[PDB]
Amino acid sequence: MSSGRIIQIIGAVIDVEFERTSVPKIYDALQVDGTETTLEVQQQLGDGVVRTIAMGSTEGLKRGLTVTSTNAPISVPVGTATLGRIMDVLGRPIDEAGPVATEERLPIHRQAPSYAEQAASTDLLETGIKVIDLLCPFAKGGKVGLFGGAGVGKTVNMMELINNIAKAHSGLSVFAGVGERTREGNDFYHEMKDSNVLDKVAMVYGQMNEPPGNRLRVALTGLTMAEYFRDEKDENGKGRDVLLFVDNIYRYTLAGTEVSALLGRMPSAVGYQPTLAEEMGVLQERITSTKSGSITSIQAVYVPADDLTDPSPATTFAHLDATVVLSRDIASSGIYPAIDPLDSTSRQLDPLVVGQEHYEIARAVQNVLQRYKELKDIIAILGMDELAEEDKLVVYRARKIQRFFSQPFHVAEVFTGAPGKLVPLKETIRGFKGLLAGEYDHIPEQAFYMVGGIDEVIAKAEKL
Amino acid sequence: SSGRIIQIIGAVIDVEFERTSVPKIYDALQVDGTETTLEVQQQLGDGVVRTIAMGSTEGLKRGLTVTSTNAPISVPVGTATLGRIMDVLGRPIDEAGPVATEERLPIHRQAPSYAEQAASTDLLETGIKVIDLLCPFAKGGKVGLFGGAGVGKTVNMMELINNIAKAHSGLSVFAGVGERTREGNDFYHEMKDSNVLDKVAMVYGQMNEPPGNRLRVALTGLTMAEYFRDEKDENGKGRDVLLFVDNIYRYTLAGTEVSALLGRMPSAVGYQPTLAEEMGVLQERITSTKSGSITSIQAVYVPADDLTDPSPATTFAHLDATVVLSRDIASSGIYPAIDPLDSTSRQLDPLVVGQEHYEIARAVQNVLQRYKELKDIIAILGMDELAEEDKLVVYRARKIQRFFSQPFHVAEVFTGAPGKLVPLKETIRGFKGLLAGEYDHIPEQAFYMVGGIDEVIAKAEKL
Amino acid sequence: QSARMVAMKAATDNAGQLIKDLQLIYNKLRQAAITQEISEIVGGAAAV
Amino acid sequence: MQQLNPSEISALIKQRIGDLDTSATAKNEGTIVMVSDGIVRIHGLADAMYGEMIEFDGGLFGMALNLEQDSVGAVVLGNYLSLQEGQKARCTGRVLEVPVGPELLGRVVDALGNPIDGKGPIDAKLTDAVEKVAPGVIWRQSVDQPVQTGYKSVDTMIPVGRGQRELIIGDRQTGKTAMAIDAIIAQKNSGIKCVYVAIGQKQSTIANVVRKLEETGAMAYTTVVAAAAADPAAMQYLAPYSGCTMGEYFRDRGEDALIIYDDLSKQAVAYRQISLLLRRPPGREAYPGDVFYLHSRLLERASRVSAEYVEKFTNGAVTGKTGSLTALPIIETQAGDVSAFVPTNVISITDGQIFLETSLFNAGIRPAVNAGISVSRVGGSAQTKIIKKLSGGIRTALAQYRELAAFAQFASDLDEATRKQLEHGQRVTELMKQKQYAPYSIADQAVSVYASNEGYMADVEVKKIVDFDAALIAYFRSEYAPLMKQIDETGDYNKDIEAAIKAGIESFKAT
Amino acid sequence: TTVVAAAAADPAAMQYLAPYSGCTMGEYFRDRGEDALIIYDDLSKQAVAYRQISLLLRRPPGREAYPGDVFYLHSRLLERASRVSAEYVEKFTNGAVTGKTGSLTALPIIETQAGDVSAFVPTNVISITDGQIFLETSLFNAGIRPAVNAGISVSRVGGSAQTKIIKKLSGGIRTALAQYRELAAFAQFASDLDEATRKQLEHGQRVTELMKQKQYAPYS
Numbered sequence A: 001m002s003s004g005r006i007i008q009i010i011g012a013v014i015d016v017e018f019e020r021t022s023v024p025k026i027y028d029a030l031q032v033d034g035t036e037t038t039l040e041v042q043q044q045l046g047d048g049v050v051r052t053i054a055m056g057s058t059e060g061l062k063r064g065l066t067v068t069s070t071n072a073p074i075s076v077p078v079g080t081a082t083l084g085r086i087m088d089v090l091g092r093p094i095d096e097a098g099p100v101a102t103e104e105r106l107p108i109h110r111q112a113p114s115y116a117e118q119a120a121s122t123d124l125l126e127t128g129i130k131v132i133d134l135l136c137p138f139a140k141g142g143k144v145g146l147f148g149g150a151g152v153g154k155t156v157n158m159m160e161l162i163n164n165i166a167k168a169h170s171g172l173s174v175f176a177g178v179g180e181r182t183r184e185g186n187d188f189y190h191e192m193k194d195s196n197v198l199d200k201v202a203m204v205y206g207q208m209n210e211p212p213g214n215r216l217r218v219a220l221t222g223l224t225m226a227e228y229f230r231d232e233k234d235e236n237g238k239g240r241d242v243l244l245f246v247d248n249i250y251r252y253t254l255a256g257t258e259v260s261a262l263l264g265r266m267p268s269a270v271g272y273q274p275t276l277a278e279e280m281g282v283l284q285e286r287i288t289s290t291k292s293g294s295i296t297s298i299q300a301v302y303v304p305a306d307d308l309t310d311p312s313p314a315t316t317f318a319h320l321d322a323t324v325v326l327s328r329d330i331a332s333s334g335i336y337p338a339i340d341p342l343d344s345t346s347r348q349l350d351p352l353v354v355g356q357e358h359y360e361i362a363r364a365v366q367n368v369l370q371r372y373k374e375l376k377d378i379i380a381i382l383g384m385d386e387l388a389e390e391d392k393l394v395v396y397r398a399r400k401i402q403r404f405f406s407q408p409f410h411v412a413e414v415f416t417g418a419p420g421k422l423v424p425l426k427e428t429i430r431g432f433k434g435l436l437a438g439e440y441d442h443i444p445e446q447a448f449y450m451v452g453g454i455d456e457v458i459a460k461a462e463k464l
Numbered sequence B: 001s002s003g004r005i006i007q008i009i010g011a012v013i014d015v016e017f018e019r020t021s022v023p024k025i026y027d028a029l030q031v032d033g034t035e036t037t038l039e040v041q042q043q044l045g046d047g048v049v050r051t052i053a054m055g056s057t058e059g060l061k062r063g064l065t066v067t068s069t070n071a072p073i074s075v076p077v078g079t080a081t082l083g084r085i086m087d088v089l090g091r092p093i094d095e096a097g098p099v100a101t102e103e104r105l106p107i108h109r110q111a112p113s114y115a116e117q118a119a120s121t122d123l124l125e126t127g128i129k130v131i132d133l134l135c136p137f138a139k140g141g142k143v144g145l146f147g148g149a150g151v152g153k154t155v156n157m158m159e160l161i162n163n164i165a166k167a168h169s170g171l172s173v174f175a176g177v178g179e180r181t182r183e184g185n186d187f188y189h190e191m192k193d194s195n196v197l198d199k200v201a202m203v204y205g206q207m208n209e210p211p212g213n214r215l216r217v218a219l220t221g222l223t224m225a226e227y228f229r230d231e232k233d234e235n236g237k238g239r240d241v242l243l244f245v246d247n248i249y250r251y252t253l254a255g256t257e258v259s260a261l262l263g264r265m266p267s268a269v270g271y272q273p274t275l276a277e278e279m280g281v282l283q284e285r286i287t288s289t290k291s292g293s294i295t296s297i298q299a300v301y302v303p304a305d306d307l308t309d310p311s312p313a314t315t316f317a318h319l320d321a322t323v324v325l326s327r328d329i330a331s332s333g334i335y336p337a338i339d340p341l342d343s344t345s346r347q348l349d350p351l352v353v354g355q356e357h358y359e360i361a362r363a364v365q366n367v368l369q370r371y372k373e374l375k376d377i378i379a380i381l382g383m384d385e386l387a388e389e390d391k392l393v394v395y396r397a398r399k400i401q402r403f404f405s406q407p408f409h410v411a412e413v414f415t416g417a418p419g420k421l422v423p424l425k426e427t428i429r430g431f432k433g434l435l436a437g438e439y440d441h442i443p444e445q446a447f448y449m450v451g452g453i454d455e456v457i458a459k460a461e462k463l
Numbered sequence C: 001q002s003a004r005m006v007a008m009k010a011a012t013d014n015a016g017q018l019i020k021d022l023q024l025i026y027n028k029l030r031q032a033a034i035t036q037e038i039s040e041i042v043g044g045a046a047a048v
Numbered sequence D: 001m002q003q004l005n006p007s008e009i010s011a012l013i014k015q016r017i018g019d020l021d022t023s024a025t026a027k028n029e030g031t032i033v034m035v036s037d038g039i040v041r042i043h044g045l046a047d048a049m050y051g052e053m054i055e056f057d058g059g060l061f062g063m064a065l066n067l068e069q070d071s072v073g074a075v076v077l078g079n080y081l082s083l084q085e086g087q088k089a090r091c092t093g094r095v096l097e098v099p100v101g102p103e104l105l106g107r108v109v110d111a112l113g114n115p116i117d118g119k120g121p122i123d124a125k126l127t128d129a130v131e132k133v134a135p136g137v138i139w140r141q142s143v144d145q146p147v148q149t150g151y152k153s154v155d156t157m158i159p160v161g162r163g164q165r166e167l168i169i170g171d172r173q174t175g176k177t178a179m180a181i182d183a184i185i186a187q188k189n190s191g192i193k194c195v196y197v198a199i200g201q202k203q204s205t206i207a208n209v210v211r212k213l214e215e216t217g218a219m220a221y222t223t224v225v226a227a228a229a230a231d232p233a234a235m236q237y238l239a240p241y242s243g244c245t246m247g248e249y250f251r252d253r254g255e256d257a258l259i260i261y262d263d264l265s266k267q268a269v270a271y272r273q274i275s276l277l278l279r280r281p282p283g284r285e286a287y288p289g290d291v292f293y294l295h296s297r298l299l300e301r302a303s304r305v306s307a308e309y310v311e312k313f314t315n316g317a318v319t320g321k322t323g324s325l326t327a328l329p330i331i332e333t334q335a336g337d338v339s340a341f342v343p344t345n346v347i348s349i350t351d352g353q354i355f356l357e358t359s360l361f362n363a364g365i366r367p368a369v370n371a372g373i374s375v376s377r378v379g380g381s382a383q384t385k386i387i388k389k390l391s392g393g394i395r396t397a398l399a400q401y402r403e404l405a406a407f408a409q410f411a412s413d414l415d416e417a418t419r420k421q422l423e424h425g426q427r428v429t430e431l432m433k434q435k436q437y438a439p440y441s442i443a444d445q446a447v448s449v450y451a452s453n454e455g456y457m458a459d460v461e462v463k464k465i466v467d468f469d470a471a472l473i474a475y476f477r478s479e480y481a482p483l484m485k486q487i488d489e490t491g492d493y494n495k496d497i498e499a500a501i502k503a504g505i506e507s508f509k510a511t
Numbered sequence E: 001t002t003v004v005a006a007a008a009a010d011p012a013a014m015q016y017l018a019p020y021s022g023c024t025m026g027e028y029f030r031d032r033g034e035d036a037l038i039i040y041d042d043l044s045k046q047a048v049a050y051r052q053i054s055l056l057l058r059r060p061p062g063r064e065a066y067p068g069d070v071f072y073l074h075s076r077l078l079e080r081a082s083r084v085s086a087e088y089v090e091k092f093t094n095g096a097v098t099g100k101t102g103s104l105t106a107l108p109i110i111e112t113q114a115g116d117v118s119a120f121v122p123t124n125v126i127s128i129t130d131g132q133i134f135l136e137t138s139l140f141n142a143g144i145r146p147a148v149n150a151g152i153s154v155s156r157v158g159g160s161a162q163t164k165i166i167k168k169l170s171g172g173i174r175t176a177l178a179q180y181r182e183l184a185a186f187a188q189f190a191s192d193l194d195e196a197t198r199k200q201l202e203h204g205q206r207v208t209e210l211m212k213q214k215q216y217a218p219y220s
């Protein structure tokens, strides 16, 4: 008989007593009897005494009030119908469009993936964005560092990513709002809806209007969603490979600090939870590929105080695999996306990964873009025609490069007309190589702007 | 009769005794089972007492009987201990069987009274240019070596031993406190290759043993020295005392290891607030008295190269000669890496080293000081933007720096070149000539890792 | 005129370098100060 | 008054009311009381030993930490979520054992001798207690024997002897792991032992390294132990000790070995977490003061020993052999945090250190070796006579060169001496580079450095010089094969040998 | 002269209380219509020792492990040092002495870490004292012996405690020092400045060198 009664209440932490013959284990779920609030076992205090946290407001509550358990960690609905649906951390609909259709429920927690299941290969995700596709290729089951301020089309880039992964690789998309502000969340919803992509993504937000535990566990919630979809096998096995979008993991670490402090435990070097690395990892290891299916992660990253040596970003980089940065100037230069093709770093940038020729090509592009960047100041100050004509050739060629790296987007089609263009490698590679050969030094920069492959570029150039 | 364990944490243990007999504050305690000894720490009262471990902490179970000796730690003392290597308890480890002395002396005692304080005012050369100029020694004074990690402190210790102890006649004692065993074995073998091994007596406590052993180890050696300083020479006052200590900071670290476990709250930093007291009781047991003279050499590790951590600062006020190494200068390749600036000696007045020596030292010091202030501007502007005198200053100071590099007869293992024992007269002559500018046409490299000014000229011509 | 121009360019570059240096040290010092103060606070709270 | 003892439990109180003594079979079985985060306070085990493994009715193990007047505190070995108080635990009487011996080779295993590779249940003849102290001073032996890196820069400036300790240190992804694996491959005929420990790494990464060693055949004289970030903190905190214990086996048989400590920093982080979770008052940067002791206890165990010492460890089983054990630690810093607390402590203990510069790696110099702060305290005793003679001041000269170049960045009035010094320093700089998985033979470095000291290289192009070297070696191995054969068989420098080298050099310069 | 000794290895409370006794003797002279002086050597050690003592008492700690009352300690210590009215002592002596008045000056020593001034104990003692007297390391290293830094050391008392002649003279000296300190940043560029500024700098240099003195060599 699992009914236990409240014994002590402070703030958000909650204490209950039970019988010393039937004691719930840690991370078990407690539903308050007569109300819709839920309690989460944290540490066994002996004497049938348990200290737990609550999930939401704590008002009016009074001691000695009966509470039952579930003898199990938190389980939420999972299934195909979960797309186009916004649920809480508890997987409970907030779209207010009926309950969840599925009856399939899975506990939130599970151990780390087996060493045996780590796929003995490492290959690259295909994307059609023509920039990461050369400079920072993604691994299969990698972590992509993303940086930059708002208003540069973060949502737009996510749109295009989702479109491509669902289209070619039949990927499924899950998004988790950690510490979300409601207004932008609703805007993102409306964008999911107008751009006909909502039907393919599963959405859960944790607002900064909630106690920390909500915000901490939305992460594992979305994670488990992704796990269920991947492990959901396809025909002939081989479940999908899926992408995961998570906002401001730094907020996650902050909420972890929150709950650790509320437990009354001492801080860390800066003052984070001393256990920081534990939860960071527990998040990480369930992000990988397997012999069946794969999972890849996109994570919004914010660096408070610009400290590359702060513990939180330091722990982040311990798992980062590729870095992508967004520019303000580049977007102001009418180039979209505004990915800086000079700071983005990929662990996968090796001739042993993208191949020999691809690697060398990318290195050469990097050299050209650098070379032109230090050229810029002299061009500004000491004029232009006071330099080596080869350097001027470099200038023109780099300008063509920059003009070219932007492209139309299939998501941009509904935005401003101009249907986007999907482009794989082995054409980007060839076109860029030919550009490096200087065989296109007879053409204005315009043919490279807002265009697909080099064949399209030449078509425009002839037509221009 | 006997007591037994109540709790075990790390190196701190508790014993329950009958109110009829409870041990005194410092007493040797024999674990009645395995081979382990305990030192009383606090009179926890009600038959409860707190102690520290002297061996491993294993096999120990709560309730095992233990007896007192009613006596603190007393180790063998005398000439029979010399040429030997004993443990923190005086037990031999050199496999030379038991020591043939039955004299025993406790490790604790009171500081020498003020009335018995003696003053050493007699110079002591080292054959080391930068030191013998900037840091003179008094035979029997307190000299310490400050330095961070790997800055060459140990090497300096061996060099000083080579250039002093061998030329010295009489006994000598050195002990390491939490050291790398390799160097210890090497050093012992080294004296074995020599024939002064008899003259020295040897002690180890290393960074491989329980912290209790790490704690009260130097006490043994300094007590050896107290004995010897107080041993009257046959028909005269006792021969001088050669004392050498490694990593005194490790003492404070050992105290730190348990300071919390004593129930003490943390000090301003994780250090123990008692710090100064156990520092001083150590330090004041090192002075030279009317009877006997003790020459104290101390290498001091610097945490994080923070000279102003509490431990270096607090230690600092107990030495007459200050010697600190700078990590960057070593990174600049110079050996020894002794800062010309911070390192001082109380024997630096014209009334001791001679007016001329004091003048030259003051002058070169001021030149280096001036350059150091000047050093920032050239980082922003071209050196040419400076006055001509300033350029002279820059070149003079840089060549001085080059000249400080002195090859040593121990450093040949690193490189192969032989050392230099430059007489002070040559040093002073060379520096007067340099600050006379007699060499303002000489490439700087002619001064690097050389001997005397004559060698500088020879190098320059070889250039 | 040429020499002055070049010297000004070099000055700008050295300024940038020093800026990097100072910024790094500032980050370190801020971290250290935060550590010290939080240690103080937790010790004082533990006092009761 | 003060807080309750976490041992005053109405059940226990009522039991003592019934009768005080004979508690829990003279305390052979313990019952759990307090549960949080892999940390368990337990009542009723006095027979239990400090530092003992603790069995569980859950089938798991526990680590003895605090023996106290009324209760015991312990840390959980493995996942603890399957626990709750009121369960049974006992004291094994064995203390912290782990399998060890030849059978361990070519296996991927947990920090408790548990096969995590799933390639069959691993067996053993012997286990051993994990925690021990390093032998006495009269039992150590001066390091004198070569260790190969296949690296020009390393082997040249930083000799490595068997039984020494050298820190590799740098910033994130400076190729530290690469250096280690190179060292491992650099041992395939030395007949020496080698084992690898990783801390807080991604399982994917671990598998990458595993497969690399597989295809290289490295999985024939080696073993690996994994401390992933998912692993419980205590597991990671203990794993290096297990690695040390496994390694010492062969030094206990008068044989040498190399163990690769990866991410000791993360290990320190985990142990700090443990200590704080034990309410241990912290010091600077929240690390408890024992961190120095923490590492030293590990580090000092690996060394070269006196043959009679092992002959004592043997029962006459060995007729006297030089026992030794070398280790390789890895420390990660935050943007040039060279004066950082933990690394400073490390250096205080190591007998050698190697630091890699980030920008030079980004500048493509690989390995990007800061010759300045990179030393091996033993010195030339760790290399063949050839390397001893040819080297001797090159590292110092390079450091002085870089100092001058740094000072000359705003100087343009050089004499000829300094100008040639800077030229030669640049030269020697570009000399010291190679690609991943490029093991050099000793003769390679020998002829190269000889030519360098012989000005055959100041005359050539700062770029072409790398070709000047590659083609040079190709030429030489094409022609003088028995000569290098002999010298790499012995490492001996003779004057006639030097003349033959000069002949090879001139013949190459003629081509 | 008289000195009381609290050696480094002496019991903590001995250091903790010695300055009080020294003050007792100083007052004793002051209360005889006389005036005298005492020297306090590095109150820092005293403060640290009192910290230790308090901590052993499990006293509630504060910043840098210091309980607040350390202020109270130093305050009530230095407060005792001052000059009294002749009437006060005269009645104290019960008319045994009438003419003279009592006085007492004291000098405490504070040791700085990296020359920092924001340190707690320095902050307090500065807030208490009549004024600062400061010395800079590099000046001693610049040969300036003593190495007083006039830029920050002052006395609220002012010339009131100086005789007619010295107060009459010190003015232009202070002015010249202020001028030289003013032009410090350009001191390394005496090639393009004003000639009169060069003269001011030269005067400052000369007076700077004038402020050198040996040890044990006081001046009438």
Ligand SMILES: Nc1ncnc2c1ncn2[C@@H]1O[C@H](COP(=O)(O)OP(=O)(O)OP(=O)(O)O)[C@@H](O)[C@H]1O
Pocket: A350, D171, D172, D173, D174, D175, D176, D177, D178, D179, D366, D367, D434, D435, D436, D437
């Ligand atoms: N000598 C070399 N030549 C060419 N490439 C190299 C060399 N050394 C390292 N690299 C490259 O550097 C890349 C990253 O280095 P590595 O992964 O070994 O760093 P790490 O020690 O694992 O650091 P972290 O622990 O942060 O991952 C590798 O992909 C490798 O290709």
Ligand SMILES: Nc1ncnc2c1ncn2[C@@H]1O[C@H](COP(=O)(O)OP(=O)(O)O)[C@@H](O)[C@H]1O
Pocket: B148, B149, B150, B151, B152, B153, B154, B155, B156, B335, B336, B406, B407, B408, B411, B414, D348, D375, D376, D377
């Ligand atoms: N006189 C010298 N000449 C050249 N190199 C030296 C000299 N003295 C020390 N070194 C270098 O400095 C290091 C000294 O370290 P060591 O003194 O053993 O430890 P610590 O200084 O930490 O006590 C050695 O690695 C050696 O290469």
Ligand SMILES: [Mg+2]
Pocket: B148, B149, B150, B151, B153, B154, B301, D348
């Ligand atoms: Mg040292």
Ligand SMILES: [Mg+2]
Pocket: D176, D177
């Ligand atoms: Mg690595």
